[PDB]
Amino acid sequence: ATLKVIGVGGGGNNAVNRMIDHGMNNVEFIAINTDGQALNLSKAESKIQIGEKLTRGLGAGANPEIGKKAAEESREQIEDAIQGADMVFVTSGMGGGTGTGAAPVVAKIAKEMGALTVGVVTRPFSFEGRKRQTQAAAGVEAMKAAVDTLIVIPNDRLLDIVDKSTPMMEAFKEADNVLRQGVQGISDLIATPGLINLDFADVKTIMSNQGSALMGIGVSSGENRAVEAAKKAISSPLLETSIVGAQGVLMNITGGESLSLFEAQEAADIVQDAADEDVNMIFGTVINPELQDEIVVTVIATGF
């Protein structure tokens, strides 16, 4: 299966840049923007400049209707850049002009090309004011009607994981992990045969036409590794949608040869009880003999 990550507008393109520098295998990156200066600095292999005539190579100036229209007018270049993708991740900041207006169009186009379409977007900081927050909300609602699943990261949550001195760049790297480990987690599932297998058709069943979603990875070792890794997978400090209320779950456990049946049940029960609901689970297990005492739990939850 072909996975693509599409950054749209300034925020999304920076997050794509950071992920490219972090280093990501078997994934194609597309950078889409009106801003010609930021595109030139993008590390993505595929770059699409939209709205050249509209903005003369600048950003959309916090006007989301210009973002929308720039993407509508370049829909055939966007189609060509997406063609062949089984799964597309569309990431952008909501609140401004290009991301807020263009991202829902890009996602709509991706979905009617037949790709599984996931959105990962941000809401602006409260200090940016009410109007910015309101434009962002319209953007999230537009995104929600265009994608298969939506992950929303409110930027105000970044204030929950920093101390007074944490560099702004470091804060953003933490927000990046959500998209990056979700992408990496799915990429690993697709490629890796399991003792209890999960493949792309399982990802499609749990994500298709679901609305809100959560994606998480948890790694742990030692005494209560299964339970701790599972708790870390569903921990949502940055997430708008927590695990509570999930009706559909894809869950994978990867461990070494010592991975116990009893442990797998423990981890699966954590996910069942945290959701505080009957969860309808697709469950998988990988035995990676290269691992030692490390356990890795991957969770994708939808159906809210």
CB atoms within 10 A of CB 104: 30
Tell which one of 2, 133, 177, 192 touches Ca ion (CB under 5 A). Answer: 192
Shortest distance in whole angstroms from residue 193 CB to Ca ion: 5
For the record, the structure tokens of 43 come out as: 């590390």
CB 260 within 8 A of CB 295: no
Shortest distance in whole angstroms from residue 196 CB to Ca ion: 9
Of 41, 85, 280, 26, nearest in space to 49 by CA: 41
Size of the site for Ca ion (CB under 5 A): 4
H-type alpha helices, the chain: 9-22, 36-40, 52-55, 64-73, 75-82, 98-112, 130-146, 168-191, 200-207, 225-233, 261-274
Sign of the dihedral defined by the CA atoms of residues 281, 285, 291, 294, in that order: positive
| Only segment of 82-90, 167-175, 190-198, 239-247 that touches Ca ion (CB under 5 A) | 190-198
Binding mask 133-172 for Ca ion (x = CB under 5 A): ----------------------------------------
For residue 46, what are the β-bridge partners? 30
DSSP 176-227: HHHHHHHHHHHHHHHH---SB---HHHHHHHHTT-EE-EEEEEEE-STTHHH
Residue among 26 and 40 whose Cβ is closer to Ca ion: 26
Shortest distance in whole angstroms from residue 179 CB to Ca ion: 21
| Only segment of 37-45, 65-73, 89-97, 194-202 that touches Ca ion (CB under 5 A) | 194-202
| Only segment of 73-81, 181-189, 200-208, 230-238 that touches Ca ion (CB under 5 A) | 181-189
Residue among 43 and 204 whose Cβ is closer to Ca ion: 204
Shortest distance in whole angstroms from residue 286 CB to Ca ion: 7
Shortest distance in whole angstroms from residue 167 CB to Ca ion: 38
Residue with tokens 């993008």: 42
CB atoms within 10 A of CB 262: 8
Residue among 97 and 284 whose Cβ is closer to Ca ion: 284
Residue among 77 and 192 whose Cβ is closer to Ca ion: 192
Let me know how long the chain is. Answer: 304
Give the C-alpha separation, 151 to 162, whole Å: 21
285 lies in the site for Ca ion, by CB under 5 A? no
Shortest distance in whole angstroms from residue 3 CB to Ca ion: 14
CB 207 within 8 A of CB 224: no
Residue among 194 and 211 whose Cβ is closer to Ca ion: 194
AA letter at 202:
D
Residues comprising the binding site for GTP?
10-14, 18, 60-62, 97-99, 128, 132, 155, 176
Shortest distance in whole angstroms from residue 170 CB to Ca ion: 33
Binding mask 197-236 for Ca ion (x = CB under 5 A): x---------------------------------------
CB 94 within 8 A of CB 143: yes
Residues comprising the binding site?
10-14, 18, 60-62, 97-99, 128, 132, 155, 176
Residues of this chain that bind Ca ion (CB under 5 A): 189, 192, 194, 197
